Amino acid sequence: MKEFYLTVEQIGDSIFERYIDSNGRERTREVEYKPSLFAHCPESQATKYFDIYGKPCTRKLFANMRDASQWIKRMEDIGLEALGMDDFKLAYLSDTYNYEIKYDHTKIRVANFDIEVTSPDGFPEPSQAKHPIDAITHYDSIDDRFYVFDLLNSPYGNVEEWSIEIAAKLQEQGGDEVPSEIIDKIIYMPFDNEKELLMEYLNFWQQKTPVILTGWNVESFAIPYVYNRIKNIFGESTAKRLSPHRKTRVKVIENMYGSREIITLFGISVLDYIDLYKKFSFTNQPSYSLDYISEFELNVGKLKYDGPISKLRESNHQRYISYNIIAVYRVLQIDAKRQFINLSLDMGYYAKIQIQSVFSPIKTWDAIIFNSLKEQNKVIPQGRSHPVQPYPGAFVKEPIPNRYKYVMSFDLTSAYPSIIRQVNISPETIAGTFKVAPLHDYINAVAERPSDVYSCSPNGMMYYKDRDGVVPTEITKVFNQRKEHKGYMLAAQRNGEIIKEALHNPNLSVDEPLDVDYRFDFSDEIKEKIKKLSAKSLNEMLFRAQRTEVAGMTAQINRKALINGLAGALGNVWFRYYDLRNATAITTFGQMALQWIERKVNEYLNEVCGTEGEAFVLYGDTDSIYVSADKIIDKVGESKFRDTNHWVDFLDKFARERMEPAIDRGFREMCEYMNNKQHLMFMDREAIAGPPLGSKGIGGFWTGKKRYALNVWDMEGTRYAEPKLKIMGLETQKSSTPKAVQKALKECIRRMLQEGEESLQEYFKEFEKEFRQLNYISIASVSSANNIAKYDVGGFPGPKCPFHIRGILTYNRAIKGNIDAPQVVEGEKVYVLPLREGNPFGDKCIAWPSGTEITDLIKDDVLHWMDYTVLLEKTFIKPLEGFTSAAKLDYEKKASLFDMF
DNA sequence: TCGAGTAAGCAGTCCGCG
């Protein structure tokens, strides 16, 4: 096989690299890498190296990496640009792996671990590590085994060995229900003291050194805990055995208000799964505890135990160890579904970076562009300092608040990367400027044509047309990867709907799910077999289709996030290619494009309908338009349609055959107007929305910008078995809204859009009557909690104290002097409840850590003093009032002259 | 919340508004 790196580090004048060799074996080497950097030279000086602008450069070969760094400093002292890749390990990878890396994941050691630490005096601080580590479960991907290190003797209790037989048993048998598929994969090691446990763990770590290290909060908790505990017990040199090069650094992570410490293990790539999840999942969760996330992702029940975790080991060591094992497996189960590790490896190897650098689009793109330029013997510019400056972004159209019955939407494929490619926006393609007219003049095509030579953006910028910039070239490559994976995702989605249809009429038989590839549209043969399958088999197929869809989503959305990150990176001062001319060229062209196509679609629809000056486009945001199709529907008349699917087909056909050619003609004219390199403004039909045929549903509504709901029947080629609500921005979509309230508001919306006013009034009346029975957690608001100290004046709210911070302070007084009570963590999330006047807590609300039951110290007092009235008005009624007045509807029945009967 | 960007919505505090 072709070789590939595992990890790379610079340590002084040496590169330390772990890698897989041509025979598929892991090796390590130390290389005295001689880096090169560059300086501009005279024209007369013969060279093959040129900066991105075509100015000649001489290569400076250094005796070592420290000489190279020192040279960069002196060039600053002199006042001269020092060109080239200043991160030497990135240049090393480029030289050493001068080809597209093809990696084999089966050779990469991926370690997933979790530790347990009993603590009677509060949260065990990883920087202190004053309490014994009493359990470690460490899954190794190469062995496919869970290694369990169990501490039997501790100052906090001596315990008996853990029993695998009881672990496997049902909870209804007094067992722990450790999943049977991992039982044979557990290698259990009890220890009589902590020192033996830790020395054996380090010997194990030496034999099976992680390349990729993950788990849940491993970077902020487990890794610093283990390191500092070992350091405390044995000293530094032993703790540094966690690094294969025996080098570690304490790293300070600084935020807006405060800072924390982590431990960098040189030669390991730590990818904390909580952080992978936050970056790649595109959710915002009320809580990030593993139980919460696991439940959300897998629909697995919460790990039940009695008492606090701090007394769990001594009261039920059996369950304690089982739950530590299950904790490790849950992260693996999430990964099987989300595939964020696979993603990270793909992106990391593509860019040629340390895999942990995937968290940084700036680092990722710097590497990609460096490698691309290096191939043409071009030399990257030095990074420079820039003051942060605000700059303009997208246009969002102000919608008229209303119900909207029939709606069709259109959206530009990868808007910003497409603009980059079309305009040829790049650091080295800047050709000059032209005199700018007001944006509205370009939108209405009355402004003077910017250029007859160069490709233009309405911000005043001009770009070369003879050759693609490096930014268009490289953004294109990742876009095509994105496009491929989106294809698989959509095919999996469409296949899902086929399965859902067949489920309505399943066969009464015993059989098996079909062996198929859900990334491709089902053949007719497959479709026929599907109609003859059982519910059991169909549901299993649905699950597999949906997993395939998720695999596709992960791959596509995060490649889109990567290319969109490059457009944003041009407006970040730390990016090597920061330039506000280029960032604003993108965003200003986007504004023009949207408003241009708005005018074109309006002009076209007025023409087909025979009207004049009427607004068909009701809304748009960044790169989308929402088109009212009432008039298109009315032109044939609702009476002509057999069923809902009939008018959906008609609208689908009208968009593809009439509107999209008009849209394409409109954008081609704009392309020529701007003299752009390549026409790439492609505005695919997204949604077809309206009420069920013959119903009293309203179809959709807007309340304002970025706030709307639609009853969708078809989403870019996916025809739904059951209509799907597309709700954007409304309270049903905010993590701050109580769970039960999200659900109730969504049903209210479903009824509005599908069934009409009376149905909505029926549901509201019922919800208002029963809601006080709802579980307190389901009706608690959620908020992030920053700057708790700032608003704390002697345990009481200071001036301008936010409502949720007020709640935390109320909580803090109520649990004061309890080092056992759960503490609210600065920067994390809390549940929030209003409290009735005259409550014993002495304030109008209380807050407690999100994802958890409130401590039994105060629970039933909270339940007794909950202000359901305020809770209802604030979270449910006020938002519902917003929805209904926008939609010109009433949630409560108005009195009629009929009432006199 | 270490980690590409801007636009913009709503909750809440403080305080004017004769």
Next chain:
DNA sequence: GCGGACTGCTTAC
């Protein structure tokens, strides 16, 4: 009571 100035939080894109 509402709304503007403001902070805080969250979402759409």
